Structure formats: C-alpha cells, structure tokens
Amino acid sequence: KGEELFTGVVPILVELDGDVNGHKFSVSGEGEGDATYGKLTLKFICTTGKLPVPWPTLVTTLVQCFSRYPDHMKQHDFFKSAMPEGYVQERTIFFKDDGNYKTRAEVKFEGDTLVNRIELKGIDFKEDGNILGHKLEYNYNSHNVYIMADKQKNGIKVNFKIRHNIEDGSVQLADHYQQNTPIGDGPVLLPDNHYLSTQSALSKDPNEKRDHMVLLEFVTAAGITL
Amino acid sequence: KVEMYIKNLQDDSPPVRVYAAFALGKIGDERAVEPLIKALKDEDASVRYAAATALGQIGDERAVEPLIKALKDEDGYVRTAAAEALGQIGDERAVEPLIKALKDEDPWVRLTAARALGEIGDERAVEPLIKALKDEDPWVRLTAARALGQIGDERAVEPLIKALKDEDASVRKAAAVALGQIGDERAVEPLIKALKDEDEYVRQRAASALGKIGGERVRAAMEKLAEPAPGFARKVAVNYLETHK
C-alpha cells in the first residue's frame, strides 16, 4: 500500500487552527503533490481575516510523505509507509530570542485526498519582535531535515533549523524538534539516519484579495549511500 | 560528488536531473555552470527551474545570456527563477531584459524582475520602476517602491511621496522605507503626515524613515510636532527630541 498510493499526482487539503499570544486564526490550504518529483503546489488562505504572524513562519507546519525518496532509499520512507491511516506529527519550534510554537497534526488519506489537519499554539512572543511585528521577508530558504528512527516506539525523531530572512538583512532562526508516530496498525519502516533537502518558493495569486500564500516546494531524501 | 551530480544531470529520469541541479547550486562549484546551462533547455520544466535556480546560486556571469533567454520560457516559475537568478548574479547585462520583464503577463514575474532590478542597483531601472509603481498588482507596486529605495536615485522621491497615499497599506509602508533609504528631505512633511496613517506598520516605518533622514529639517518638524501633534506622532517627536540632543 504505502508508497503505492503516491505514484501519481495526489490532491491535498490542509486545515490549521492557531492561537498565538491570544490571536486566534485559521488557515485552509488546497493543492497537490507529486512524490515522484518531491513536488508540492499549494495555496493557503487565512479564513479568519489577517494572519497575525508572517506566512513564512507557518510553512513547515503547513506533508513530508510527498518527499522524493530515491530508489535505493525506499526502505527509509516512514511517511508513505504509515499511509493510508497516516501519522501524528508534533513539533516545538523555538524562534531564537522570541516565542515558540507547539503543534500537533494528523496526516492521512481521507478518501482519495491526503489531508493535513493541525492545531498550533504559540506563546511568549515579543509584541514588536520579528514575528508579531511582521519583520520577516516573504521568501524561504533551503534546509536539511535530519531524520532518525525512534528507538522506543514505531516512529521517527526529526530535527532542523529554519533560517528566516529578516528585512534589515539579518537572519532569524527557528529550531524545529519533531516527532512522528503512526496512527494505524499496519507496520512501518523504521529508517536509518538520513535527511531531506528542501527548496521552497512563495508567491501570491493575483486574483486573491484574501490574506494568502502560494507555495511551490521540492524535497528529496538523501544521505544514504548508492 | 560534484562530478556525480553533473553526471546525474544527464539521467533519463527528470527527477534525478531535478535534484542534481538543486544540489549543484548548493555546492556552489563553478564546474557545473556549463552542464547547468544545458539543463536550462531540458524538456522538463522542473529541470529548467532547478537549473535556473542553481545558476543564480553559483553566481557565475557565464550564465547571464542563457538566463536572459529563460526570461522567455513558457513556464512562469522558470521565468521567475530566471529573473531571481539574474538579480543574484548582479551582472549589468541583465538590466534591459529585466526592464522588459516588467511587462510580463504574470505579475509575480513582474515582481521578481523589479526585485532583481533593485538588487542590481543600476540607474537604468529607475524610470521603468517608477512606472511599475502604478502597476495594477499591489505586490509589484510594493516591490517597485522597495527597489527604488535600494537604487537610491533622487527621481523616485516625488513618485514615492504619491505612493505614500496608495490604497494598499503595504505599498504605503514600502514607500515610506524607500523614502527613508533615499534620504531626500522633500520626504519630511509627507512622512510626518504618514505618522497619522491608520496602519500601525506604515506609522512605525515613517517614524524610522524620519530618523534616517535626520538633519535640521527633521529636528525642526519634530519641535513643532511635539507641540501640535497628538497620538503616535507626538510620541515619535518627543522621543526624537530626547535621543537627538
């Protein structure tokens, strides 16, 4: 099953409910993924008005099952192996010298659709900091996402640092600590240590007057030899 | 390994080529410039996009004419990566072809070209960028404003004063930063008014724009503002008079 469900273009839905320093919001995303290209094409709208944080701070929260695993690495793809029952993903994200987000999501098929549902809580943000003071540039860097088997349970531990460009020419770091565990019974691949190498471009929809983000993303697994 | 990715650029499977191209832009080695220029004509648009992205990252001026050409690609993402790549390389030969791209059908392509023109810093962009301030798309207008700020040419001062009244808060905000960056003192009174703007971020940027302009003109406008102003505007002035002498 697992990887089988991903052989063509799969439609995606994303739903996020967040509350950061008391400002509640929600975001709905729609688009598609092509795991053979490690490619995502998505549009996200804030359905509750203006987004109280910068859109780039939410890119990682807003489907690593669409990463490209190369042929020789297929036995390390935990994400697709958990499907269709899917997995729970949890993070804490520490914005250096500022607040943090804690998040919990379920990623699974609902019908023919891969759906990411998330709840996000963030606190201790600085009112005129980079986040809440909207000082981040509307762009996105390339990163390496480090993945390891969870020694204790069927699942993985994942760690990385997101670099967020600030408009004055400095960089804000967001340290991600992540855990994924399967939802269902179907056994899962517990992978050797490896990483994903990511690329993302943010844009806007010229017909869209709501607060929104368009996203194009390319991700491949790597760091296993052959 | 750079050897390996250059080799994988030739693979049958487009995905293999795609991530070969990205990887090579990351490594930054000059050896890959030639084979990546080849990949700019790959039949797969994802490959073309990766190749263009990587050529921007390598920073090598031998990719400039090949990328000027990718400004005409049928794919808007490829054309976007081409414009961004030329901004990053900074070669002045890109200026007139990016000037043209200011009229692309895809507004994100227009936006990216305007960004790239600010990054180059070439004077020739000033007038077309001034026109892009009236683009239908507010993202383009914003980015044109920010690019004129970075070019720093005095011709943009009056058009930017006007943009300070644009219907979109984000354009007004970028117009205010740009005025601060240019430092021309005609901006003082208009900026003092933008301290009255409804949008808090417009307000704060007009405040730091005035801090950057400085000089006797700002000083006197603040002595006056600390008397007949109210709200944020008055705090800005009392604060300024404190810190500045």
Author numbering:
A (entry chain A): 3 to 64, 68 to 231
B (entry chain C): 15 to 259
Kindly provide excerpts from the paper associated with this entry.
bGFP-A–EGFP (complex 1) crystallized in the monoclinic space-group P21 and crystals diffracted at 2 Å resolution. The asymmetric unit contains one copy of the hetero-dimer. Clear electron density was observed for residues 3–231 of the EGFP and 15–259 of the bGFP-A αRep. bGFP-A consists of 16 α-helices, which superposed well with the last 12 helices of a previously described αRep-4 structure (RMSD value of 0.367 Å for 168 atoms superimposed). In complex 1 the helices of bGFP-A are oriented perpendicularly to the barrel axis of EGFP, whereas, for complex 2, the helices of bGFP-C are parallel with the barrel axis. The majority of the direct protein contacts between bGFP-A and EGFP surface are located at the N-cap helices of the repeat protein. The curvature of bGFP-A creates a cavity between the EGFP barrel surface and its central repeats (R5 and R6) that is filled with water molecules that mediate indirect protein interactions. The direct interactions between bGFP-A and EGFP are mainly hydrophobic and mediated by randomized residues on the concave surface of the proteins. However, only 14 out of the 42 randomized residues are involved in the interaction. A more detailed analysis of the interfaces between the αRep proteins and EGFP revealed that different types of interactions stabilize the complexes. The thermodynamic parameters of binding obtained by ITC are presented in Figure 5, showing that both binders have compensating differences in their enthalpic and entropic contributions. bGFP-A, has an unfavourable ∆H [5.58±0.06 kcal·mol−1 (1 cal≡4.184 J)] and a favourable negative −T∆S (−16.33 kcal·mol−1) contribution. The extended concave surface of bGFP-A is sufficiently large to accommodate the cylindrical shape of EGFP with an unexpected orientation, interacting with one end of the cylinder as well as with side chains located along the side of the barrel.
